[PDB]
Subunit: 140 residues, 2 copies
Amino acid sequence: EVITVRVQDPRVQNEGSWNSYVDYKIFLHTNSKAFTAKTSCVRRRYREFVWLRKQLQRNAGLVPVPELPGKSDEFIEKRRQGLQHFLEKVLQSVVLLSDSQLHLFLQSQLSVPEIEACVQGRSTMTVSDAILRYAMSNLE
Amino acid sequence: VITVRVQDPRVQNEGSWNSYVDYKIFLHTNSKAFTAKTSCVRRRYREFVWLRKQLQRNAGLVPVPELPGKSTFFGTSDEFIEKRRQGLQHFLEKVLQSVVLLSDSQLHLFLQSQLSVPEIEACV
């Protein structure tokens, strides 16, 4: 199985107005049975990556999570490479690769809050066949 | 081409009385203009029950696929969840092939909005 991730095409959304910001296109080309989309295209702010790293650190327990680049056109390009490097490294850690929140971040044009939603409460397997039976009987 | 999978059953509100199970609906489409459109929403079974009744109203005389009830089932818990999960996916797969049902706005909100049922009844 082969996974390719490039971070291309930096663009300034909302030119000149105060909520001006830069997002980056994340092109994920896979043929891996781990992922769903075999080519995928999503735009992500830097602040979204900052969230993603904090989220990877929770689920990864004690597995090291690659660093992000801290702190125009030259800086944008330095960060662009840094973001690509970060994802390249993340996709090589098999534990991190299995994070559902990462899978939604990379493939899914969901917001961060929408990803935090699509992931809630324990699965119906990682729970006592008693809590699951209590769940199954609910009402109006 | 439109693809729908119903995956990742989960228990929201573990142990407390308003404990319940919802299912992730992954709707993956492509126009050849773009690359891949996705979409991810969690839905209770009772939400599907509503959706079917709503599809039947607007569909006039077009047959609406069946949902999985509780029938002759001897299995484990985890087994029932998985039987229902397939049943729900089957139901949506069938619904998405009926061109009339596919054009229901309430279905489009159910599959692609993170709106409540009452919020969908409002938006319409």
